[PDB]
Amino acid sequence: GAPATVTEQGEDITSKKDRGVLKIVKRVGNGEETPMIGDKVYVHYKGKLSNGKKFDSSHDRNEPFVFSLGKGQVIKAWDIGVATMKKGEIAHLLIKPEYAYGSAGSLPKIPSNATLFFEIELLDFKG
Ligand SMILES: C=C[C@H]1CN(Cc2ccccn2)C(=O)[C@@H]2CCC[C@H]1N2[S@@](=O)(=NC)c1cc(Cl)cc(Cl)c1
Fold first, then answer.
1. Ligand 1 centroid to 74 CA: how many Å?
2. Neighbours of 40 (CB within 10 A)
3. Sign of CA pseudo-dihedral 2, 116, 7, 34
4. CA 66 to CA 28: how far, in whole Å?
5. Residue with CA nearest ligand 1 atom 31
6. What is the number of domains present in the chain?
7. Where in the sequence is N6-acetyllysine found?
8. What is the distance, to the nearest Å, from the Cα of residue 11 to the centroid of all Cα atoms in its chain?
C-alpha cells in the first residue's frame, strides 16, 4: 500500500541524508515557490501508524491545521517536509521516530519508537 511504497520508493529530503524522512509527490502543486520560515501554513493531512491504524485526520475535523513553519511547533519531519512543498501539492511522508516522537511517543495514540506515514496537502502559505 501507500506506506510501503513511500518506504521503498521515496526520496530522502533530510539535510543529513540519513533517510529519516522520505517523500513522494502525489499531486504536483503550483509554480516553483515553497513557503519561507515563519510563514503561516495551512494543511490538510491524515496520519497512519505502522500497524495500519489511522491516528489523526484534519479532514475529519472540517478545518485545516495551521502552524508557523520552521519554528518547532510540529514534529521535525513536518517542518522539513512542508518546507519542500508547493501550494496545492499533495505529498506522502514516511518518518522515522528521530524526526517525530522518538522513544517518548505521544500518549495516547502514538507508541514509543513509532515510524509514521502522512498524506499532506499544502493548501496555502502566507507571511
Ligand atoms: C494534533 C496536531 C499536530 C500535533 N503536532 C504538534 C504537537 C503539539 C503538542 C503536542 C504534540 N505534538 C505535530 O507535530 C504533528 C504534526 C502536525 C499535525 C499534528 N501532529 S500528529 O498528526 N503527529 C503524529 C499528532 C500528534 C499527536 Cl500527539 C496526536 C495526534 Cl491525534 C496527531
1. 7
2. 13
3. positive
4. 21
5. 56
6. 1
7. 16
8. 13
- Alpha-carbon distance 87 to 70, whole Å? 17
Q: Residue whose CA is closest, atom 25 of ligand 1?
A: 56
| Atom of ligand 1 minimally distant from the CA of 107 | 28
Burial of 126 (C-beta count, 10 Å sphere; 0-12/13-18/19+): exposed
Q: Cis (ω within 30 of 0) for the bond into 108?
A: yes
For this entry, resolution in Å reads 1.0
Residues facing 126 on adjacent strands: 40
Q: Determine the structural domain holding residue 28 and report its residue range.
A: 1-127
Cα–Cα distance measured from residue 61 to residue 65, given in angstroms and rounded to the nearest whole number = 9
Task: Please report the sign of the dihedral spanned by the C-alpha atoms of residue 72, residue 73, residue 76, residue 78.
Answer: negative
Quote the CA–CA distance of 63 and 47 in Å, as a whole number: 16
End-to-end CA, the chain: 36
Residue of minimum CA distance from atom 19 in ligand 1: 74
The residues annotated as belonging to the active site are 45, 55-56, 75, 101, 118
